[PDB]
Write a protein that holds these residues in place. Structure first.
Motif, PDB file in Angstrom:
ATOM      1  N   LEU A  41     -57.745 -34.777 129.303  1.00  0.00           N
ATOM      2  CA  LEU A  41     -57.963 -36.063 128.632  1.00  0.00           C
ATOM      3  C   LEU A  41     -59.324 -36.152 127.920  1.00  0.00           C
ATOM      4  O   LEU A  41     -59.397 -36.565 126.762  1.00  0.00           O
ATOM      5  N   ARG A  51     -59.252 -36.718 123.911  1.00  0.00           N
ATOM      6  CA  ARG A  51     -59.576 -38.098 123.535  1.00  0.00           C
ATOM      7  C   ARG A  51     -58.465 -38.734 122.700  1.00  0.00           C
ATOM      8  O   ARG A  51     -58.680 -39.053 121.531  1.00  0.00           O
ATOM      9  N   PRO A  69     -55.151 -43.313 126.227  1.00  0.00           N
ATOM     10  CA  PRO A  69     -55.603 -42.466 127.338  1.00  0.00           C
ATOM     11  C   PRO A  69     -54.946 -42.745 128.692  1.00  0.00           C
ATOM     12  O   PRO A  69     -54.715 -41.811 129.455  1.00  0.00           O
TER      13      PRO A  69
END
Lengths: 58, 71, 58, 71
Positions: free
Chosen positions: D41, D45, D49
């Motif tokens: 993650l 980005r 998210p």
């Protein structure tokens, strides 16, 4: 002939604002006020006199 | 190596700014505007840097305030 | 001009997923369900709306 | 200094996931896949998210599930 204007970025910040920020951020993290940005900015202004020009500027 | 951060510490229900761990609290509230201000400060190198940084915060607070866990 | 894409790693995570994870992990540790990974993933999806975009993204 | 962790607390017979202390329980079940997902993650980005992290868990659950105290 080094001075504030000539220092590397990190050295400049460490000379000018890092000490008061460390203190202020610690106070802010303890208080957790409703307006944290304003609180920090206010903290800087209130305590400026104890931290100002305590560096190369003299 | 860097994206490894124990939050199992802090968890040991409803999460708000008041209950966040210290680092998360700061990252939610002041780190963004500080990062921007510190960058502006380092580039300008003004005669009154603490005052300048405080002014920067005040002037740009409106773009950064309440953009976090408490709308 | 800082935004989510430019934040340091920890700040990014603290802005996006850390709050919902803290809540979810606390619920998971209390429930101890038969399928904990699925439970946590489900928790994220169910409670996403209360945590989503409450950050720099606005 | 770091490898010092009182488990004499929790011990004060047959140990399973249900009886483990909170931190051990989490470390046995979700911390590995979370560490991996949080790393993915942070590198990507993406626009969504929380959704992305949940999807990561679901997609990689098969490589991580039941690799703990309860086979």
């Amino acid at each position: 002939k080094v001075d504030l204007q000539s220092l590397p970025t990190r050295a400049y910040l460490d000379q000018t604002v890092v000490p008061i920020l460390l203190q202020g951020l610690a106070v802010l993290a303890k208080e957790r006020p409703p307006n944290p940005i304003e609180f920090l900015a206010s903290y800087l202004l209130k305590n400026k006199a104890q931290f100002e020009d305590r560096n190369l500027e003299r």
